[PDB]
Ligand binder design. Sequence first.
Ligand SMILES: [Ca+2]
Ligand SMILES: [Zn+2]
Ligand SMILES: [Zn+2]
Ligand SMILES: [Zn+2]
Lengths: 4, 99
Amino acid sequence: LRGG
Amino acid sequence: PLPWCPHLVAVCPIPAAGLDVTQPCGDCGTIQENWVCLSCYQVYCGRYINGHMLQHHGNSGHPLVLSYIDLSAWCYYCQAYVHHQALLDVKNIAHQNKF
Ligand SMILES: [Ca+2]
Ligand SMILES: [Zn+2]
Ligand SMILES: [Zn+2]
Ligand SMILES: [Zn+2]
């Protein structure tokens, strides 16, 4: 769930 | 989550041609979890796939990227999801292409  | 960030200034106009949410990663060609860069509109895979958008960030410094899976926008510098009415159009254009 960290973006990018 | 952030309701604004100082990197929203870097967001460029949506290409006149629009978006393609099924576009493959420009480096590995996967279709799994791709993101689109809100500065240059190149498409690369997420950091849980092969990390090519992260690589793109490293090469370009472009801050904000949009997920083709759930239409969340991530800022690499703020290290957070950002939601703001400046992103309304791009998310709608992506949504419309997706559905
Ligand atoms: Ca198009
Ligand atoms: Zn890739
Ligand atoms: Zn870019
Ligand atoms: Zn930011």
